Amino acid sequence: VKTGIAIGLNKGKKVTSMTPAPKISYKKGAASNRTKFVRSLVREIAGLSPYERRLIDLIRNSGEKRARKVAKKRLGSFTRAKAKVEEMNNIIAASRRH
């Protein structure tokens, strides 16, 4: 909700701000139940890539802070290095534990 003056925080005119319906474009990347099943199975067959093995090696050797430092040069971004090192932590958990 806006205040009603042309400077400040919510700024400006107070109208009936209510309301739209949700766009079907906005759920573009929704896991779903196909792509979940297909991505789960295609990882079974097969082969976590050579860098994905190196990151697993570095997680179990020198923790993260080095997994990510190397992942972000291997991948492009820091946001991607984070999510990669996080999925590597999860496969480490799902495989090594029990």
Binding site: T3, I5, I7, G8, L9, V15, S17, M18, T19, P20
Partner: protein, 198 residues
């Protein structure tokens, strides 16, 4: 190659501009072509207007938001409100914009009655029954003009509290400039020490 005392000019003529000078002698010749082009389109589209019913829409950019204006196409929300289909609307002479969405009740209601007033005034011919000869009204957008809604009255009473509207704007600006710095000076000295303290 510098003035007596003259303004420093920026005349951008160091390319081969002489090879792409475009003089509009064709203005009068194009004007009659556009009028003939309109007359022939109205003969083709025989009993129907040349332009489709446009919706009302408030202009963006705070400089211009003070005035309303004929937007591109109504909306899937306004079409459903007025009581017709986004397919049927396009065919019987209403611009429908799949993109635009409604976040404003005054614009929504304005456009919804604008669809209801258009539906009231048109008389849609049946597919194969009979053609009743209705002489064509050319400009639909001239039949349904864009009314800039008058949002106040002539004169009123001074419902005064005396808060100095200058001092109101100046404090509102200060609240903006120190919103984050006060949240930081409230996260330390106020809390993060009280979180340990009894």
């Amino acid at each position: 190659a510098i003035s007596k005392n003259l303004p420093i000019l920026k005349n951008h003529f160091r390319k081969h501009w002489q090879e792409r000078v475009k003089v509009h002698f064709d203005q009068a010749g194009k004007k009659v072509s556009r009028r003939n082009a309109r007359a022939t389109r109205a003969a083709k589209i025989a009993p129907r207007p040349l332009d489709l019913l446009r919706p009302v829409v408030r202009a963006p950019t705070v400089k211009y938001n003070r005035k309303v204006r004929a937007g591109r196409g109504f909306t899937l929300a306004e079409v459903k409100a007025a009581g017709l289909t986004a397919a049927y609307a396009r065919t019987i002479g209403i611009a429908v914009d799949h993109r635009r969405q409604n976040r404003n009740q005054e614009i929504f209601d304005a456009n919804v009655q604008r669809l209801k007033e258009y539906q009231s005034k048109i008389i849609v011919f049946p597919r194969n029954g009979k053609a009743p000869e209705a002489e064509q009204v050319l400009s639909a957008a001239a039949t349904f003009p864009i009314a800039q809604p008058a949002t106040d009255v002539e004169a009123r009473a001074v419902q005064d509290n005396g808060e100095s509207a200058f001092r109101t704007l100046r404090l509102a600006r200060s609240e903006k400039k120190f919103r984050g710095i006060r949240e930081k000076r409230a996260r330390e000295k106020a809390e993060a020490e009280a979180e340990k303290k009894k």
